[PDB]
Design an enzyme around this catalytic site. Structure first.
Site, PDB file in Angstrom:
ATOM      1  N   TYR D 162      98.552   4.687  53.567  1.00  0.00           N
ATOM      2  CA  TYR D 162      99.440   4.792  54.698  1.00  0.00           C
ATOM      3  C   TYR D 162     100.843   4.283  54.375  1.00  0.00           C
ATOM      4  O   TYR D 162     101.831   4.970  54.619  1.00  0.00           O
ATOM      5  CB  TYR D 162      98.858   4.008  55.856  1.00  0.00           C
ATOM      6  CG  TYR D 162      99.626   4.143  57.132  1.00  0.00           C
ATOM      7  CD1 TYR D 162      99.378   5.202  57.998  1.00  0.00           C
ATOM      8  CD2 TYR D 162     100.567   3.212  57.496  1.00  0.00           C
ATOM      9  CE1 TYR D 162     100.043   5.315  59.205  1.00  0.00           C
ATOM     10  CE2 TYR D 162     101.282   3.334  58.683  1.00  0.00           C
ATOM     11  CZ  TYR D 162     101.018   4.381  59.546  1.00  0.00           C
ATOM     12  OH  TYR D 162     101.704   4.520  60.747  1.00  0.00           O
ATOM     13  N   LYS D 166     104.282   6.622  53.963  1.00  0.00           N
ATOM     14  CA  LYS D 166     105.430   6.394  54.785  1.00  0.00           C
ATOM     15  C   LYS D 166     106.698   6.037  53.961  1.00  0.00           C
ATOM     16  O   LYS D 166     107.815   6.475  54.280  1.00  0.00           O
ATOM     17  CB  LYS D 166     105.146   5.305  55.819  1.00  0.00           C
ATOM     18  CG  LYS D 166     104.113   5.668  56.903  1.00  0.00           C
ATOM     19  CD  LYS D 166     104.514   6.833  57.769  1.00  0.00           C
ATOM     20  CE  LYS D 166     103.625   6.930  59.011  1.00  0.00           C
ATOM     21  NZ  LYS D 166     103.855   8.180  59.830  1.00  0.00           N
TER      22      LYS D 166
END
Lengths: 257, 253, 257, 257
Positions: D162, D166
């Site tokens: 994650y 990002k």
């Protein structure tokens, strides 16, 4: 850049330093437009009077002035107190100050270094700690906005003292953010590139002197004052209610490198 | 920590400030072991002679000392000048200083704040420019290594003045890197966490700091020292304008 | 240059990917001089044995090779396993990968973007989690070192996929540092500017191309390969025992902006 | 937190992805209130019809919906094309996506990592290059606002894929700011901490699991959806006209560290 809905600051009690020239004057004008009640500080009495007059007739603004030099003995504490008193409390501080004495690093003059630290770092830092204490005692949260610089974030030739001072203030701002955050006080900085204030035009006006600077700004130009003021109004508003400890560059992508 | 091959600093002329206590003693010891020639500065004549004796005896190191108060006027410029006279130029400045007056930001005392800036920021900053002017004029490059702190990089409660000062010196160091880089001079900073010097261990309360360090401990002096030696050597020949956290992961956040 | 004292890596078992050319070949040479034992990966079996030979010849080093295409989904898990079998564990992982498919961002090709992501970000991240798992299980710590780029820290035109991929891996490394740190595993990155490998000199040889990149490097030149190797050897050694989660630019000041 | 004056987006044409759930629905509500014309993408046809209808009934908004799967061949460039043809051009992209498969780095699952990258990084980046192409071509400027995460800026345990995804997208955004900036296109990211959408409340509502996280936020709470929407509206507005290449943490101070 007109201020309505969430960007209103009706009844908000805001101290704005260096309020009568360049950036400060424009943030004062934005805050007036947005409905703010103003404490305005500065070194020239008649500029402060003009300012009270203008913002009163143009926006009906509640304006109290304080003529003081923040290098005078105890000026930070004195200005903090007087400002809180003006309207029974402060909801916002715009920490605005700036001198610059450009010189090659090999030629740095101690007097000019110290002057730059005094005006850009020391007095703003101690104004903010005092204001912050009064904000904590009063218990209504609040907002502190440092007018710093892109020079706080990326080093610049001939700007040893300038850069140094602004980078320190920016860190000063983050400590406030960290400790005063739990009291609902939000501390953040705006970090402009060159701003085309009257003085800005005078100093960066030459195409070939400013050309190297511009070629490092993707949007291909310098900032105008209302762009800085926009960012400050936003940070003061409830549209920034989670924003704390942040540096907002107003620099067209400069500081990305 | 033995410094051999490229981590030898044989012949390098190094000014190390605050050399008689804390991390500054360790760096001096490490540089002495590395083969450096040292100019040590500090406020106390006896400790400075003591230092010069320990290092001469233990490492056969050339050691000149300058007893000076950097708060006195033109003192930074004077130390620079005298430090360079010692061996006819400086190849390394270790800009080492540090005092700390912890208080809540709401309680910040102007005199303690002024003093922190004077000592942690002002004197080092002006020592560096003068030293750099002399490095530019000599034409032999050089390495300026600032001893900052992880607190220059992340705010630390009760450390309003301290954090401000060090964040300032780190940017000072960056303007040196930008303007002196062309002349072959490298300016970089080392940003440790709490260092378990003699005074370090006594002062460090710590559990919440340690929770933020993935490696599960504070740094020991030689680890800061390793980093400075490296930055001064030819194994850092391309390293310029950089901040080396010596912090276990702390400043990742 | 030369690796002695604390920079010895005697008996340290190190997997180095992209090891047959450029930066990877130079790190393999350094690690070999430093007394390391090597597992080298690469695409060509013929280029790999030329590496085992040149390294065996110059330094008498233990070299085991794995011929593999990391672009392939199953590759990282295979390389981790196979690397583990060479010397019964790993002490150091050096993640060195690179394809670069430069093109204006407006013209980004999906396939080229995908290949870049697969080789520059995904393969290294999955190799690293796998080698990390094993390093945790052994209980003897370790060092993971990502060879990223200055392009992972500052965006560069034409490098949409390249910058994107290496910025991701630099964050991956940081999570490795955060999670594996408690177990004595140091994860850090080296972020070089242009490095004059045989290839880098060809790609950046044109003056009109190199000149504006050099204008931004205060040191006024690109990096040479050993300058990168020096950083990696340092990070591997006990001289960097408290260094975790750090990005080291090897860029002459470029990423200061 | 309502949108008038400079924060009106009357006339503006805005593609918002992931518009039927979570943050995207709140941004779309916000832009609908600001008076924008919308293109709204998503996987589910049922929910898109309700949004076209719901936003019409409440605000009088023009909504073109696009039912599409971005994992399809050439799918991102197609949504860019369809989105722009809707009202004869795009002024704003709100590049919004997010899935999260949390697990320790040592247990990182290849498929779960690949799915995080595919959804959080690859589709968005490729959409944004296509959108940016059409903005350069039309010559009327534009703004791209990436909805990233605080996880883009600081490593978070169990968030290998994650965080990585990002952080790549944040760099993607910066390359766009650098290359498209000269064409008056502004690219920026908002980086929220946990946001209390329906699911957000379900995943982080337990004051036990979320205490260590809140400890690290100086304001003492997570973000609410509208606080993200405000930052996005602001970035889309003329009150952010010099803001380019900037990450705005919407995180109460967390990412100061």
């Amino acid at each position: 850049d007109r201020y309505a809905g969430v960007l209103r600051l009706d009844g908000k009690r805001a101290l704005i330093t260096g309020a009568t020239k360049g950036i400060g004057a424009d943030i004062a004008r934005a805050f007036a437009a947005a409905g703010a009640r103003l404490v305005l500080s500065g070194r020239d009495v008649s500029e402060l009077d003009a300012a009270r007059r203008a913002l009163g007739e143009q926006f009906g603004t509640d304006v109290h002035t304080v003529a003081i030099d923040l290098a005078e003995p105890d000026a930070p504490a004195e200005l903090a107190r007087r400002a809180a008193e003006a309207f029974g409390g402060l909801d916002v501080l715009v920490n605005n100050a700036g001198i610059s004495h450009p010189q090659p690093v090999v030629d740095t003059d101690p007097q000019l270094f110290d002057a730059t630290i005094a005006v850009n770092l020391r007095a703003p830092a101690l104004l903010a700690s005092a204001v912050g204490k009064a904000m904590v005692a009063a218990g209504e949260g609040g907002a502190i906005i440092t007018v710093a610089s892109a020079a706080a974030l990326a080093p610049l030739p001939d700007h040893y003292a300038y850069c140094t001072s602004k980078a320190g203030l920016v860190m000063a701002t983050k400590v406030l953010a960290r400790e005063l955050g739990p009291h609902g006080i939000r501390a953040n900085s705006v970090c402009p590139t060159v701003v085309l204030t009257e003085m800005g035009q005078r100093v960066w006006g030459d195409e070939a002197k400013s050309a190297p600077m511009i070629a490092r700004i993707p949007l291909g130009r310098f900032a105008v004052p209302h762009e800085v003021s926009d960012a400050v109004v936003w940070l003061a508003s409830d549209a920034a209610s989670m924003i704390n400890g942040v540096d907002i560059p107003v620099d067209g992508g400069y500081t990305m490198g």
